[PDB]
From a paper:
Bromodomains (BRDs) are protein interaction modules that specifically recognize ε-N-lysine acetylation motifs, a key event in the reading process of epigenetic marks. The 61 BRDs in the human genome cluster into eight families based on structure/sequence similarity. Despite large sequence variations, all BRD modules share a conserved fold that comprises a left-handed bundle of four α helices (αZ, αA, αB, αC), linked by loop regions of variable length (ZA and BC loops), which line the Kac binding site and determine binding specificity. The four helices form a deep cavity that is extended by the two loop regions (ZA and BC loops), creating a largely hydrophobic Kac binding pocket.
Author numbering: 740 to 882
Amino acid sequence: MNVTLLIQELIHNLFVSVMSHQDDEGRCYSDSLAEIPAVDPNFPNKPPLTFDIIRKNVENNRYRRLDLFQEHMFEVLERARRMNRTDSEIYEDAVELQQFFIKIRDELCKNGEILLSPALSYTTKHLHNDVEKERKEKLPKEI
Ligand SMILES: [Zn+2]
């Protein structure tokens, strides 16, 4: 559909950037998250959400707020982290994508003079702290 908001353009740019992010061998990180189930059986009441579902919303300009877009993206990435071992490709790709998401989010918001968004309350430092805590929790279970 038709972009009527700066934030829709920003969200599209952010989504494409994150989905296209590649490792040093040109492997797309998002590829390993293609088969993540839409519903974690441990949390069966959360609405189905996948990158395919978020894409459809992004392309049809359905996100009019950064915080909702970030919430959905973080649901998927956090599910991939929860459901997989710290030594796995999926886990590590999910963390990398989440870190990259924050980096590009911040850059686009600076460029667009987006200051107020509640999405910006969750910083790179918060993500580092939260990932480090999860790694520590998970370690003994992976022995
Ligand atoms: Zn597009």
